[PDB]
Amino acid sequence: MIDKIFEIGLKDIFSSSPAEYVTIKDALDGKLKIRLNNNFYHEIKKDEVEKLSSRIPLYLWSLVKIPFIFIKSSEIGEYFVSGEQWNKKAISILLGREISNVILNVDVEKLLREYTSLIFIILSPTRSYTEETELSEMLEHHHHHH
Residues 6+ apart with CB under 8 A from 87: 64, 65, 66, 68, 69, 81
Alpha-carbon distance of 58 to 41, in angstroms, equals: 27
Residues 85 and 116 in one domain: yes
Looking at the fold, whether 10 and 51 belong to one and the same domain comes out as: yes
Range of the domain at 47: 1-67
Residues 46 and 78 in one domain: no
Query: How many domains does the chain divide into?
Result: 2
The answer on 111 and 63 residing in a single domain is no
Same domain membership, residue 53 and residue 91: no
Contact 52, 115 (CB under 8 A): yes
Which residue among 13, 43, 67 closes a domain?
67
Q: Name the pairing type of β-strands 119-122 and 68-72.
A: parallel
Residue 98, class by beta-carbon neighbours within 10 Å (0-12 exposed, 13-18 middle, 19+ buried)?
A: exposed
Residues 24 and 77 in one domain: no
Using CA atoms, how far residue 131 sits from 17, 27, 31, in Å, is 17, 28, 29
Q: Using CA atoms in the order 65, 134, 96, 54, what is the torsion angle rounded to 10 degrees?
A: 50
Other CB atoms within a 10 A radius of the CB of residue 45 amount to: 15
C-alpha 56, offset from chain centre: 16
Question: Is 72 in contact with 122 (CB distance < 8 Å)?
Answer: yes
Same domain, 123 and 75: yes
